[PDB]
Write a protein that binds this ligand. Structure first.
Ligand SMILES: NC(=O)CCC(=O)N[C@@H]1c2ccccc2-c2c(-c3nc4ccncc4[nH]3)cccc21
Length: 207
């Protein structure tokens, strides 16, 4: 396991998301499903020129997996995934410019729900999660686990878990008062409200 320090802009945004009083927390799911949809668009587009991009899996889908025993809500996709370079470096650049633009917009009257317009909607996961584990597999790299409970640092390690083939799993270790997001009725309500027209099958798993 390797440990990395977040740059100051991202660190401040993670603190804002964790600490600000904001009741409309459900938007996190729309954001993560929308990120999953974009990653699926990317692998599908690549496959149009190179069909072998799908040798790691032809199915293009989004799975919503709650687990009451573990208190986790996992968003799984068979999208493009992320390489180690994406996880440590490329996404750190996106997170910096995106945070600066979002922090700017917030001072200019914008709402926390507009986070996705700034390329950092992934961070809305901290509205409901005390820890986020991202398991990912990109065609050009190995399976990795990125993780952060904020506090200024994140970890990256080669993942020994079940081989995914290709894609990303966003594991939300829910805060104790956010367990409503493990309830079938609640997840169904949110998906219907914000994600009804996503162009991939979304399966809401049950227990
Ligand atoms: N389903 C998908 O494939 C969506 C992918 C996704 O949401 N990716 C998100 C994402 C989106 C926008 C910005 C950063 C990141 C990020 C990071 C990340 N933040 C960083 C900050 C500083 N340094 C390095 C960093 N790496 C790590 C795992 C997953 C993601």
């Amino acid at each position: 396991m390797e440990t990395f320090a977040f740059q100051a802009e991202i660190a401040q945004l993670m603190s804002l998301i964790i600490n600000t009083f904001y009741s409309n927390k459900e938007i996190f799911l729309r954001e993560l499903i929308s990120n999953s949809s974009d990653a699926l668009d990317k692998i599908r587009y690549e496959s149009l020129t190179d069909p072998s991009k799908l040798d790691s899996g032809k199915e293009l889908h989004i799975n919503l997996i709650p687990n009451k025993q573990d208190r986790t809500l996992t968003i799984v996709d068979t999208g493009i995934g992320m390489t180690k370079a994406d996880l440590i470096n490329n996404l750190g650049t996106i997170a910096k410019s995106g945070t600066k633009a979002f922090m700017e917009a917030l001072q200019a009257g914008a709402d926390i729900s507009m986070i996705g317009q700034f390329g950092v909607g992934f961070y809305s996961a901290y509205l409901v999660a005390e820890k986020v584990t991202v398991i990912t597999k990109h065609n050009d790299d190995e399976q990795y686990a990125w993780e952060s409970s904020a506090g200024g640092s994140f970890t990256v390690r080669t993942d020994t878990g079940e081989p995914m083939g290709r894609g990303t799993k966003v594991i939300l270790h829910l805060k104790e008062d956010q367990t409503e997001y493990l309830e079938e009725r609640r997840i169904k309500e949110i998906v219907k409200k914000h994600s009804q027209f996503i162009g991939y099958p979304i399966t809401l798993f049950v227990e």
